[PDB]
Design a protein around this ligand. Structure first.
Ligand SMILES: [Mg+2]
Ligand SMILES: [Zn+2]
Ligand SMILES: [Zn+2]
Lengths: 57, 1111, 111, 170, 94, 147, 8, 56, 222
DNA sequence: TATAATGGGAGCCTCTGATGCA
DNA sequence: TGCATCAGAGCCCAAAAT
């Protein structure tokens, strides 16, 4: 039952959430990358707040 | 030629300016021509006044001004620019402490300008802002669906300008108020407004059982401060009930004109419904430190009175056009303007904290980017901002008059049921009952009626003539639906001698209900039958004889008519086709009286009374949004005396100033060897020979050359590995020359791109070594003609970087545009239609000798199958054909108005005069009746068509009065065994043409993630074989056909490669492999933390990733 | 062997880590100047595989004679680029997080 | 989405036999293109497949023997015609194509009812079954002439209607 | 309608088995270059070119005609697959 | 359908109603591992009950259950089938907890996998059918005689 | 239910 | 007179008795002649072809 | 030989109500509420309507158009549900061996006469045609054997037998009673209705059922 | 890296199934 | 135990999208 709680969160392969240069040299990218980025930022910040002994709030 | 017009109805007023719904709305919004001190608080002005003053230092609004457009309209379309004006605002920054005042005029960016015809130019493309129908703000009482003897009171303000409030009498008896999904007893809110039990008991006591449900002792115990804090804790749980915080929230919810706006229409409807007068657009006020009520007590009084059944209290019909209003261009744009302004204001307050609190100007305080963005977003990406339909001039005129219930602030398509889509009785004279889309949007997209106009409040009004005594005045009163319901209105065709009603009983409407009435009871009378229908619908002759379902298609299809090089106005018109060309702005007219000085293909110079010499340049072969050619032709000659309003040039699809959407062709109604089957149409090659139904089309092609990390793209004539045969028509610079004929595969603009760094495969190493030729650094990226396209090159535009007047988007060295034109003859698969909803695709083009023909040798043009008529019940096309026959021999055209038209006797009369020309001529020329004409006459008297005993001439005339003639089969020479209906019909070539739709693909582009073929003809796409197509293959049991669709012909990469290689080698196609999108699905489920495992019969893992994804 | 069955099951943190070819430690995507992927970011070639067939990132080992080699300098395996559609990464959370399907799908399975 | 597919406007083809359709030649050249490349090699039209493809790329380089080669390529083969919505299995039927000048697909009158097709501007999609197995399935199971009775009612589906009824009645 | 389709449906318990037999036979003909055919020179399906009559290239047309002759034997478990494949390549190489 | 003049064979409607009646609810578990109120396919409890009644055990008492086409479709044994229908997260969480194995019995499962469906020419009944010509047939026969 | 409101 | 119903029955009966191939042949024949006669028959629609009964 | 009459009579085009609107009167029209106007349209399309008649008529046209539009989605969804529930049902064997069957009634109890009367032809044909007989049936001196696929002739015989008081219901193999797992069997299914002959093992019968029920969906009411 | 600064902001259908109250 | 209330689940296809 504890597998329903995640410790390691999987990261989908990049070609399935691509960052591609379109015709004009502009970049177009899948929304998952922004969702992963939100996740990573908050996780890293959590590691840092923990290391610095932040208050419980 | 002669034009004989029928009908006795005299319409006292002409049609209004047809685009006024657009033009006037926007004029009012910008108030550009009003000097600032004289502006009303409306539109852009009202938005500024709402946003300012920005309190926090205080920044105040003085006035705004609009500059001139940096570039004219033609230039904007050329350069892909928006036609717009610079917006400035004089703002003064004040320090309330010091008194210091710095005042400055800040530049807010640009605002788009409407052209003369009511459209916009946004990034080079013409756009239309479609009006949006919606619920009028106000106070409504609707029945409660759950509890029959109860009602719901809804207080509705303008969109985004406040919450809706719902008043209900709960089963427990206490009157509840619902705001932002929370409910509470209304008694609490009444106490905050300062009401006491004494005032409320005496006021509402008359309605017995309800007032006691309002009485709550605990609420009256607490003073207005305690009741206000109590309400704030109910509405915003968890937010600390600071007394200043509660006042602020409740003020913002009720009395704040910035956060709460009832309409001006909202105010009038409330005042009219509840019988009070509002000091403003808010439900209450904040005055002398407390809240003072305006609306709540009157709605509560009416609500109880309705539940109790007090006379004079009604529920509201919410689909009535008194309760439904239009939001036009000005209002929609102003709304987004108000939004951008609020964002800009947020930035101001945020800038009024930071920086130096001492040295600040308005230029330092204001960032206009939020405003520019809000407007830019509305015009480009809004749903109500649509690519203009300019297939033909009538297309855009109709587009400007459309009404949508969709869009921001409106209905979704699934959430829209029957009630909204219905033709309400109040649509009469306001919204056309006919012109609406077939399909999912039916009843949601509608069209403004011809005589209808939108008032300042946004309600559609329609004209009626006053009738006093029995006398019909010429004074017309424009009425809303609500005011129309008061009177008894006679039909427009009721007989008149002079101004007096000549009938003992008249046909009228009272609240839409038809009734027979005395001339003494007649208060008003319709202006015309034209007022019930849209402009497109008003263009259908004999509309009274057509079932509405086909008239719908007839209306809509005129929109799709292609401008023809030979276009003609119909021989049977309705009398609106001149006005449509004039309001369309396609045709060119003379300003004042004068004499024509010069006439050219390119220009017309006119010398007026003033002596001033005016030159009119003509738009020649310009490409519309849909690629039809807009081109103007001079209709006057050097030295011609013209009056004011005389035609100078014909626009597209007009003939001598009359709307020309098609051609007048000779039609025979008869089956023909099944080429007529199930709406297909047979046409004569003579139509192509004489260039009927030929249309010019222009396609625009574009290519960019940009900087890369690998080196420059270059537009050049030097392209690797191409023969001189391939480069023949390219100039020195690599652009195809004007006048060249280009076919699919041909280079339009030559271009090279630097090869992405790659190591040549050992095969290429060996190949290069064998032939001794260096692999070039650059690759051929040239723009070529796509499959199925091509024509003559009529224009090229080249824009480089670093040349005067032009700056491209970052990285782009140069841009080339090639305009390719084509003269399109009518062909098999092209779609024809008449104005009655008869539509069909051309299935056969016969040589002239096979065409059925008249005794005198004339072949018919088109053969239409009679099987299309009886189920469709559009008989107007038949009457059009009969009258068209008379006109063919008499050499005349007719104007038959809608519902007051040419009737059968009159058409017979013309047919008799026509028969004299068709026959009497022959008898003088020394020919008698034909043997085969006798045989047809024999079968005809067996049919009861002709009277027995009459002469052959007399019988032929009897048939001709029925619109039937003797017809010879061009193949045999023998007659058709019965007399056949033949005449002139007006038929249009629609915008759906096989040249555009034909597509095929072997292999081609695949999608990034799925590796499935792309979609659409423009992408070289594959057809979608969808869920339902798979069911079909499944029901056939075609397992291998289906498996091919799912693997080798789609995303099976190994499989599709192997299949191609096998076919070019003559081998049979190999067994398919795993579709790549299944691998995507597995990996997507792994990303969701689910383990998906393919297993064999032994339940052991099977690796469909072939070891590549496992360590 | 032939596929006769498809099983779907919950994935342990161990299994998720066995799938993973690396941990994505940074929100970075690709370098704004070089346009190559940023190390330890979402597109990293050391984790999800090479962008180009049988060619490492820095370009020391460019052909199939090395297949399975991992460039000491650039850290990329030399294999087919197709693997960027297949190889999974992972994020190591500082606090466990519930998988919402097992929370919000009523009646909740965890609940 | 699938390869070896196309779409066009449909037009009535009274002269067709029940197992036939009119297929525009320019569509057929693309749909069968790989087959055509092979056939263009057997006959001498091109040295090899690479040269053959390059010759078909430019429309002005296409000569008259390739049209004859394409007739040979498609010989005895059928294609699938589909019209949306595909409500039942007769929304797809197989026909032996008869190459035509012109850009319209020609549809046999008797199948219009099952497809709910008419000539007011309807379009249909074409598909090429590739393998011998797929082609066998199409010719045996899916061919229009082999499906004459409704799988729903058992009554005739392909039957006289409109003009046909009219002549016979008269 | 395919020539003799009613008789072809007569020969099988399930219309789908006819399709399997036709398809497999056509694959045999293609693989072995038609030289394993059971037809006689005058029974060969023909195709009219600009030159004149040539052999029908279509293996599915061929296979159905062959079936109608009666000279083909079809069923399940008639012979091991490898043995069939090797015996056909011995009699008619590629 | 009759009122609209649509001739349609009862046979087809019967196929659907049959799928509507596919499931039963356990009234008493008997000697089995099943629970009271547990829902399962009618086939499986009939099979279980003949294994129990032939084993000398008290059979499961069950009740007929009627469910609409949507619920029945969502309840089918195949999780690829059910999850591609609708209610994808619900279907997928219950399937993943249970460790469900899709046996690829129906059409949708094989279509998703790009497999050859179990119908028509893909039916196991006609799929393995061999063709051989009389010359090769006798040739093979003589080869088998010489061993 | 509202993470901002809760934190506040 | 042959009409929709009689002609539908004919096709069905032909299918039972003669089979697909012949019924396919029969349908094309019915198609051919039906079309042929319909064009020469002199079927048309004029406004006088909608005949108002005196009884109205 | 009038063209309208001939087209209508032959079934080439037209029906009586459409002809009535052309040569007759248009008739009663309904308000948006569904309530009928008291005054009818006395005009026919040949005579031509009055703007008021035309306007009164638009309400029903529009209501019809909206009906139609909202129906194609509802039917489509229905069809997709049907497909998802029947897709696995395939004819997987020749005989499941069941002894169970269903008895198709030839008589419906009439409430108004409160006695049995004969079911309509088409109704009986839809329940009988192409079915295998479950039990032996002897009527009118004919033996319809157990296991016989009923030809349309066989059905007409049973109808004639029922009119002669010989048989009130017919025992028949049906998918309701079939014991085949994951599908039906040849006998319980019957005719492949498109071939007028026993269904072939392997026919995807479930899909065909969903397509057969779903295709007319847009023709019902809303 | 230093005057003091201390709680946000937008908001508008039908059926089915579980859950929280008589 | 029997009944409202609410949260969450769905709502045709293909074409096209300028
Ligand atoms: Mg159509
Ligand atoms: Zn490296
Ligand atoms: Zn059975």
């Amino acid at each position: 039952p504890e597998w329903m709680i995640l410790e390691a969160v999987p990261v989908l392969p990049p070609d399935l959430r691509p960052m591609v240069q379109v015709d004009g040299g502009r970049f177009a990218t899948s929304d998952l990358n922004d969702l992963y980025r939100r996740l990573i930022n908050r996780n890293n910040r959590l590691k840092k707040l923990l290391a610095q002994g932040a208050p419980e709030i | 030629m002669e034009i004989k017009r029928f009908g006795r109805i005299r319409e006292v007023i002409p049609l209004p300016p047809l685009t006024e719904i657009q033009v006037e709305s926007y004029r009012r919004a910008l108030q550009a021509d009003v000097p600032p001190e004289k502006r009303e608080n409306v539109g852009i002005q009202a938005a500024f006044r709402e946003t300012f003053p920005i309190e926090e230092l205080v920044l105040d609004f003085l006035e705004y001004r609009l500059g001139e457009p940096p570039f004219p309209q033609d230039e904007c379309r050329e350069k892909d620019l928006t036609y717009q004006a610079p917006l400035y605002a004089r703002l003064q920054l004040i320090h309330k402490d010091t008194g210091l005042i710095k005042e400055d005029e800040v530049f807010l960016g640009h605002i788009p300008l409407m052209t003369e015809d009511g459209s916009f130019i946004i990034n080079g493309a013409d756009r239309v802002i479609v009006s949006q129908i919606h619920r009028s703000p106000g106070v409504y009482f609707t029945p409660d669906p759950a509890r029959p003897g109860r009602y719901i009171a809804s207080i509705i303000p303008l969109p985004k300008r406040g919450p809706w409030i719902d008043l209900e009498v709960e089963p427990n008896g206490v009157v509840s108020m619902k705001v932002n999904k929370r409910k509470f007893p209304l008694v609490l809110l009444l106490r905050v407004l300062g009401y006491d039990q004494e005032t409320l008991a005496r006021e509402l006591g008359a309605y017995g059982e309800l007032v006691q449900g309002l009485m709550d002792e605990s609420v009256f115990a607490m003073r207005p401060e305690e009741a206000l804090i109590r309400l704030f804790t109910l509405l915003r749980p968890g937010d600390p009930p600071k007394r200043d915080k509660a006042v602020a929230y409740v003020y913002g919810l009720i009395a704040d004109p910035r956060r709460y706006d009832l309409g001006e229409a909202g105010r009038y409807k409330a005042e009219e419904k509840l019988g009070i007068r509002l000091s403003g657009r808010t439900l209450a006020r904040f005055e002398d430190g407390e809240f003072k009520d305006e609306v709540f007590l009157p709605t509560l009084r009416y609500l109880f009175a309705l539940t109790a059944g007090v006379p004079g209290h009604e529920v509201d019909d919410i689909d009535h056009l008194g309760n439904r209003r239009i939001r036009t261009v000005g209002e929609l744009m102003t709304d987004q303007f108000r939004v951008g302004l609020a964002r800009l204001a947020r930035g101001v307050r945020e800038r009024m904290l930071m920086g130096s609190e001492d040295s600040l100007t308005p230029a330092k305080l204001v960032n206009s980017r939020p405003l520019e963005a809000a407007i830019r977003e509305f015009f480009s990406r809004s749903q109500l901002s649509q690519f203009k339909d300019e297939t033909n001039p009538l297309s855009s005129l109709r587009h400007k008059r459309r009404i949508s219930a969709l869009g921001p602030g409106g209905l979704t398509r699934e959430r829209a049921g029957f009630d909204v889509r219905d033709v309400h009785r109040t649509h009469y004279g306001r919204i056309c009952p006919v012109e609406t889309p077939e399909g999912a949007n039916i009843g949601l997209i509608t069209s403004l009626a011809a005589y209808a106009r939108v008032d300042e409040l946004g309600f559609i009004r329609t004209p009626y003539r006053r009738v006093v005594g029995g006398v019909v005045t010429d004074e017309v009163v424009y009425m809303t639906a609500t005011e129309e319901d008061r009177y008894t209105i006679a039909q427009a065709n009721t007989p008149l001698e002079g101004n007096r009603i000549a009938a003992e009983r008249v046909v009228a409407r009272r609240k839409g209900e038809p009734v027979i009435v005395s001339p003494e009871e007649v208060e008003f009378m319709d202006v015309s039958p034209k007022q019930v229908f849209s402009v497109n619908t008003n263009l259908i002759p004999f509309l009274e004889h057509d079932d509405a379902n086909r008239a719908l298609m007839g209306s809509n299809m005129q929109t799709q008519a292609v401008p023809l090089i030979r276009a003609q106005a119909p021989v049977v018109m309705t009398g609106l086709e001149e006005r449509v060309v004039r309001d369309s702005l396609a045709a060119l007219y003379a300003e004042e009286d004068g004499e024509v000085a010069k006439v050219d293909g390119n220009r017309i110079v006119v010398r007026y009374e003033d002596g001033r010499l005016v030159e009119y340049p003509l738009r020649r072969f310009y490409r519309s949004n849909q690629g039809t050619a807009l081109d103007q032709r001079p209709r006057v000659v050097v030295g011609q005396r013209v009056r004011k309003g005389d035609l100078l040039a014909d626009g597209p699809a007009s003939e001598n100033g009359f709307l020309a959407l098609g051609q007048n062709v000779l039609v025979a109604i008869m089956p023909f060897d099944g080429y007529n089957f199930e709406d297909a149409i047979v046409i004569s090659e003579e139509l192509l020979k004489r260039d009927f139904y030929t249309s010019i089309h222009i396609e625009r092609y574009e290519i960019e050359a940009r900087d890369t990390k690998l080196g420059p793209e270059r537009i050049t004539r030097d392209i690797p590995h191409l023969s001189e045969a391939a480069l023949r028509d390219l100039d020195e610079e690599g652009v195809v020359r004007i006048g060249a004929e280009v076919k699919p595969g041909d280079i339009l603009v030559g271009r090279t791109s630097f090869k992405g760094e790659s190591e040549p495969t050992p095969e290429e190493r060996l190949l290069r070594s064998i032939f001794g030729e260096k692999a070039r650094d650059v690759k051929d990226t040239s723009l070529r003609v796509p499959p199925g396209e091509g024509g003559i090159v009529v224009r090229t535009v080249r824009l480089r970087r670093g040349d005067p007047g032009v700056e491209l988007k970052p990285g782009v060295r140069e841009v080339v545009r090639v305009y390719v034109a084509q003269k399109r003859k009518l062909q098999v698969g092209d779609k024809l239609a008449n104005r009655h909803g008869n539509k069909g695709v051309v299935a056969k083009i016969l040589p002239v000798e096979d065409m059925p023909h008249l005794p005198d040798g004339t072949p018919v043009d088109v053969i239409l199958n009679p099987l299309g008529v009886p189920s469709r019940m559009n008989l107007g096309q038949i009457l059009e054909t009969h009258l068209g026959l008379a006109g063919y021999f008499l050499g005349q055209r007719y104007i038959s108005p809608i519902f007051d038209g040419a009737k059968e006797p009159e058409i017979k009369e013309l047919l008799a005069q026509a028969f004299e020309v068709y026959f009497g001529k022959r008898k003088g020329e020394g020919f008698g009746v034909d043997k085969r004409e006798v045989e047809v006459l024999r079968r005809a008297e067996k049919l009861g068509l002709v009277t027995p005993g009459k002469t052959p001439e007399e019988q032929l005339k009897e048939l001709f009065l029925q619109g039937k003639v003797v017809l010879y089969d061009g193949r045999t020479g023998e007659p058709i065994e019965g007399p056949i209906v033949v005449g002139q019909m007006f038929i249009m070539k629609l915008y759906h043409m096989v040249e555009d739709k034909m597509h095929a693909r072997s292999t081609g582009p695949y999608s990034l993630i799925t590796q499935q073929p792309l979609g659409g003809k423009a992408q070289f796409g594959g057809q979608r074989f969808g869920e339902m197509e798979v069911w079909a293959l499944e029901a056939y049991g075609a397992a291998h056909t289906l498996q091919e669709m799912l693997t080798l012909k789609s995303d099976d990469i190994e499989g599709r490669n192997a299949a191609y290689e096998a076919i070019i080698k003559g081998e049979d196609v190999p067994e398919p492999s795993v579709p790549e999108s299944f691998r995507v699905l597995v990996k997507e489920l792994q990303a969701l933390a689910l383990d998906v495992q393919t297993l064999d019969e032994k339940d052991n893992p099977v690796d469909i990733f072939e070891g590549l994804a496992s360590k | 062997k032939e596929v006769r069955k498809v099983r779907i099951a919950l994935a342990s943190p161990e299994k998720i880590r066995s799938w993973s070819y690396g941990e994505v430690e940074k929100p970075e995507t690709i370098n704004y100047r070089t346009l190559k992927p940023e190390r330890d970011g979402l597109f990293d070639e050391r984790i999800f595989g090479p962008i180009k067939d049988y060619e490492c990132a820095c370009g020391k080992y460019k052909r199939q004679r090395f297949e399975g080699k991992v460039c000491e300098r650039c850290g990329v395996e030399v294999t087919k680029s197709i693997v960027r559609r297949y190889r999974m990464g992972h994020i190591e959370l500082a606090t466990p997080a519930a998988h919402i399907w097992f929370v919000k799908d009523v009646p909740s399975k965890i609940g | 989405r699938v390869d070896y597919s196309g779409r066009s406007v449909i037009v009535v083809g009274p002269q067709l036999k029940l197992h036939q359709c009119g297929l525009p030649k320019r569509m057929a050249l693309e749909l069968f293109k790989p087959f055509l490349l092979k056939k263009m090699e057997e006959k001498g039209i091109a040295p090899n497949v690479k040269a053959a493809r390059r010759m078909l790329e430019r429309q002005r380089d296409i000569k008259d023997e390739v049209w004859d080669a394409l007739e040979e390529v498609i010989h005895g083969k059928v294609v699938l015609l589909n019209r949306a919505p595909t409500l039942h299995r007769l929304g797809i039927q197989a026909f032996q194509p008869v190459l035509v000048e012109g850009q319209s697909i020609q549809l046999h009158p008797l199948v219009c009812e099952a497809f709910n097709a008419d000539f007011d501007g309807d379009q249909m999609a074409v598909h090429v079954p590739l393998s011998s197995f797929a082609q066998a399935e199409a010719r045996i199971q899916m061919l229009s002439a082999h499906n004459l009775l409704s799988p729903a009612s058992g009554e005739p589906l392909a039957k006289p209607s409109r003009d046909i009824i009219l002549g016979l009645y008269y | 309608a395919e020539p003799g389709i009613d008789k072809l449906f007569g020969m099988v318990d399930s219309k789908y088995r006819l399709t399997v037999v036709v398809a497999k036979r056509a694959q045999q003909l293609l693989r072995h270059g038609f030289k394993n055919t059971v037809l006689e020179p005058e029974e060969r399906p023909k195709m009219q070119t600009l030159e004149g009559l040539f052999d029908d290239p279509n293996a599915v047309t061929w296979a159905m005609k062959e079936l109608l002759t009666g000279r083909l034997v079809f069923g399940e478990n008639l012979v091991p697959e490898d043995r069939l494949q090797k015996e056909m390549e011995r009699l008619y190489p590629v | 359908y009759r009122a609209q003049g649509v001739k349609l064979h009862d046979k087809h409607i019967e196929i659907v109603v049959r799928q509507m009646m596919k499931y039963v609810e356990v009234t008493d578990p008997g000697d089995s591992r099943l629970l009271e109120g547990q829902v399962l396919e009618k086939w499986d409890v009939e099979a279980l009950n003949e294994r129990l009644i032939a084993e000398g055990k008290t059979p499961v008492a069950w009740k007929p259950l009627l469910m609409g086409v949507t619920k029945s479709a969502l309840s089918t044994k195949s999780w690829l089938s059910a999850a591609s229908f609708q209610n994808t997260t619900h279907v997928l969480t219950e399937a993943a907890i249970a460790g469900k194995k899709d046996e690829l019995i129906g059409l949708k499962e094989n279509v998703i996998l790009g497999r050859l469906i179990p119908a028509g020419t893909g039916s196991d009944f006609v799929r393995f059918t061999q063709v051989v010509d009389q010359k090769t047939l006798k040739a093979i026969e003589e080869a088998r005689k010489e061993a | 239910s509202d993470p901002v409101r809760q934190y506040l | 007179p042959q009409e929709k119903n009689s002609l539908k029955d004919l096709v069905y009966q032909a299918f039972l008795r003669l089979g697909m191939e012949k019924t396919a042949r029969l349908l094309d024949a019915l198609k051919y002649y039906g079309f042929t006669f319909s064009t020469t028959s002199g079927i048309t629609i004029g406004i006088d072809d909608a005949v108002i009964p005196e009884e109205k | 030989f009038n063209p309208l009459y001939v087209m209508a009579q032959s079934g080439a085009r037209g029906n009586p109500q459409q002809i009535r609107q052309l040569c007759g009167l248009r008739g009663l029209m309904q308000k948006p509420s569904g309530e009928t106007f008291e005054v009818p349209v006395r005009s026919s399309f040949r005579e031509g309507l009055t703007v008021l008649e035309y306007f009164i008529s638009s309400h029903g046209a529009r209501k019809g158009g909206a009906d139609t539009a909202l129906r194609t989605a509802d039917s489509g969804y229905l069809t997709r549900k049907l497909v998802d529930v029947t897709h696995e049902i395939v004819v997987r064997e020749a005989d499941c061996g069941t002894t169970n069957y269903i008895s198709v009634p030839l008589f419906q109890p009439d409430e108004v006469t409160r006695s049995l009367r004969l079911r309509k032809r088409a109704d009986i044909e839809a329940g009988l045609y192409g079915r295998v007989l479950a039990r032996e049936v002897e009527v009118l001196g004919v033996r319809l054997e157990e296991g016989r696929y009923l030809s349309m002739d066989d059905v007409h015989l049973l109808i004639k037998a029922a009119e002669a008081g010989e048989i009130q219901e017919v025992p028949v193999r049906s998918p309701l009673t079939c014991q085949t797992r994951y599908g039906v069997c040849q006998k319980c299914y019957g005719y492949d209705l498109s071939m007028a002959r026993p269904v072939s093992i392997g026919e995807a019968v479930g899909i065909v059922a969903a397509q057969s029920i779903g295709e007319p969906g847009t023709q019902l009411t809303m």
